Amino acid sequence: VSPVIATLLLILIAVAAAVLLYTWVSGLSANVAGTQVTGKSLTLIQATWAR
Amino acid sequence: VSPVIATLLLILIAVAAAVLLYTWVSGLSANVAGTQVTGKSLTLIQATWAR
């Protein structure tokens, strides 16, 4: 009755690993920060200097 | 003679499930509708109004 018991334990193992892959994949996603785009250059109201 | 009979029934089972996977996969495909792309904007022949 060896084959019958062997097959059962193998089925359970592969199911458990697949579900674990899902959690890891989805957690991996939506895990990217990125950047902001600086606005257009600031208009120059004045440039001057003093002592 | 247990192992000999056990193995045979297990072989048949896995073959049947694989063929069933195929039908389901292929049926799943080619099952996407999609969309049409509206033509370019309609040229305006006239805009008017009355009482």
Residue corresponding to tokens 């792309």 = B37
Quick one: DSSP state of residue B25? H
The Cα B37–Cα B27 span in angstroms is 26
How many beta carbons lie within 10 A of that of residue B18, not counting itself? 9
The Cα A15–Cα A40 span in angstroms is 53
Give which of B21, A13, B15, B19 is closest to B7, Cα–Cα.
B15
The Cα A16–Cα A23 span in angstroms is 11
Compute the 3-state secondary structure of chain A and give helix, strand, coil in percent, each to the nearest 5.
55, 0, 45
A51 to each of A27, A32, A48, how far by Cα in Å?
59, 49, 11
Chain A residues closer than 8 Å to B6 by CB: 1-4
Three-state DSSP class for residue A18 = helix
Q: Mutate which of B2, B11, B12 to test chain A, going by most A C-beta atoms within 10 A?
A: B2
Experimental method: cryo-EM
